[PDB]
Symmetry: C2
Subunit: 351 residues, 2 copies
């Protein structure tokens, strides 16, 4: 069976799409990618041993369906390019993980009678997925709320995180300072590198921190902690083994990208989410589900301060943290990858 | 007031000598150094703005004072070199901090009628100091036992450590995992770098570690802890602010060079001393004083192992550690520099 995946690196849709592709390739499936030449998937997908076909959508990015149809020549051309690719590759089903390229791609598949399956990783539907869903044979979403009735299947999560012991077991008999894990990602989180050292000064002996500063920020954060009078805290540029860090932690302080929220839920860890601000507030919507379940606390930019973070952490006892961890695990969906792959398989079967 | 300090090729002798030098220079005293052009003092002393005269003694092969004294022409020449140096500088007194170069220097001062003051930093007198004591006007030792009746004045301690709050204040209300500070010095202690990660594995959550690995060993030790399943421990190449680390720690695992032992006592901290093995067992004798006071535990490499260290730490309760801490502080002398400085002043005035 042939599967064509539409998922660009922008918006981070390529990673979950890659998870599904690899899962199906292990089932004998042939997978081909549909993306754009000057985007991240152009370099990453080939490194995964997967072939990729390109189309041009220049000037069409950021346009919703009404805006696309208002550009007759360009939308028709991208649509014709995708149609040619699909007539040649002849996929049995097309999977759209979100992203602008999936618009013309989805329209091409649909016009050719190829079933379209979509997956939305965020708490709020992306511009393209929102309208593409109307010609989709099957629509899935990671969290509830992005779409009114789409089956909730979660996002793919790293196997090592999924393998972690349940919260009660992991936290059993644990006493001593609340272990705070600060995660900034490869590039690091500027606001966290600046805020946490002062938070440490306010909380003193009540917490033990492992702060991941991001590339080239190890030295300055390490210095900030010493200046705050809490030099004993651990600061690393990166964390290669997130599963090991999650197993150690009592609570995590980090941004709320969609995959990150799913990973946190699967790890069964309480979190204090600092959503990246944006008029769309995508990350805010990604974290909301966990906050609603009482597994995390969201502090958007408009309320972020040293005192807000410090007071928030200080208010969480070990009993409260255990409850939050369990609620996180409960809000988790461990087999998102298999579920999506199975639905893509069922739809290709025309069942 | 002119003083000539004679201290050999080891920080053990040189560092305390520099403290006494600076202390007196800030009081109008003129100070000059006597050492060897090939040893570390040749580079360090000039960096402190102090002039340094050298004694050239070739063909020793590392034997030291015992060899020099067994070579008639060599001892005669070294003694005359020192006399020429003292005839030109005309010091009112000379301070010997140990080391073979102080031997010809002391003989020279004695032959010119210049009083000789000695300071022994270790639990066992160095051979040069032992013989020199036979012509010295005043002998002082850091710990009792080096010499039978020499005044005990201790060793110079960095003042940021001397100012650390008392054990009761530091440990008041402190709970949680025992904080273990592993110190290997600028070059690191290979055995500690290899032993502590394994010890961490055995003690798990009962301890929190801050391991100072030494130059170029940060990454290998960091990796060792991760492989031992305890990646959360802090690992730093160096520790500049030792006072801050000592403030944080509950117990210290380190070598027992003389200055280190005095520093541990001043910090009022329990310690697991791992003496550097040698025929003279110098470090063993430096530590023995604290252990006898019930402020530390000594473990020589022969009976040193993962289980040996882990078992020792696991056997110390917080109540016990507080006791040891108080014992350590009680066995401390905070005015070593001022004390030796005063004795030097008294002798120079022929009091």
């Amino acid at each position: 069976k042939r599967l064509m995946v539409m998922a660009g690196g922008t918006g981070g849709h390529v990673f979950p799409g890659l998870a599904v592709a690899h899962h199906l390739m292990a089932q004998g499936w042939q997978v081909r990618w549909l993306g754009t030449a000057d985007r991240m998937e152009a370099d990453l997908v080939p490194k995964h041993g997967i072939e990729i076909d390109f189309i041009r959508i220049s000037g069409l990015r950021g346009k919703g369906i009404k805006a696309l149809i208002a550009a007759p020549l360009r939308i028709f051309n991208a649509w014709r390019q995708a149609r040619a690719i699909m007539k040649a590759y002849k996929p049995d089903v097309v999977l759209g993980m979100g992203g602008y390229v999936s618009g013309p791609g989805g329209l091409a598949a649909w016009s050719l009678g190829i079933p379209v399956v979509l997956h939305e990783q965020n708490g709020i539907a992306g511009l393209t997925n929102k309208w593409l869903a109307k010609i989709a044979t099957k629509v899935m979403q990671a969290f509830p709320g992005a779409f009114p009735n789409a089956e909730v299947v979660g996002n793919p999560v790293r196997t090592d995180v999924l393998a972690l012991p349940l919260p009660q077991q992991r936290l059993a008999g644990r006493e001593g300072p609340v272990r705070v894990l600060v995660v900034g990602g490869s590039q690091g989180a500027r606001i966290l590198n600046q805020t946490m050292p002062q938070v440490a000064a306010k909380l003193g002996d009540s917490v033990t921190i492992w702060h991941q500063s991001g590339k080239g920020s190890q030295q300055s954060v390490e210095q900030a902690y010493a200046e705050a009078g809490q030099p004993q805290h651990k600061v690393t540029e990166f964390i290669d083994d997130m599963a090991a860090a999650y197993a150690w932690a009592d609570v995590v302080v980090c941004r709320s990208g969609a995959l990150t929220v799913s990973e946190i839920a699967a790890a069964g860890l309480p979190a204090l989410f600092v959503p990246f601000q944006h008029k769309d507030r995508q990350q805010y919507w990604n974290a909301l589900p966990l906050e609603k379940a009482g597994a995390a606390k969201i502090i958007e930019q408009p309320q972020l301060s040293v005192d807000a973070v410090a007071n928030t952490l200080a208010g969480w006892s070990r009993e409260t943290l255990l409850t939050m961890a369990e609620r996180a695990r409960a809000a988790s969906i461990p087999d998102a990858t298999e579920r999506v792959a199975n639905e893509v398989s069922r739809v290709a079967r025309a069942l």
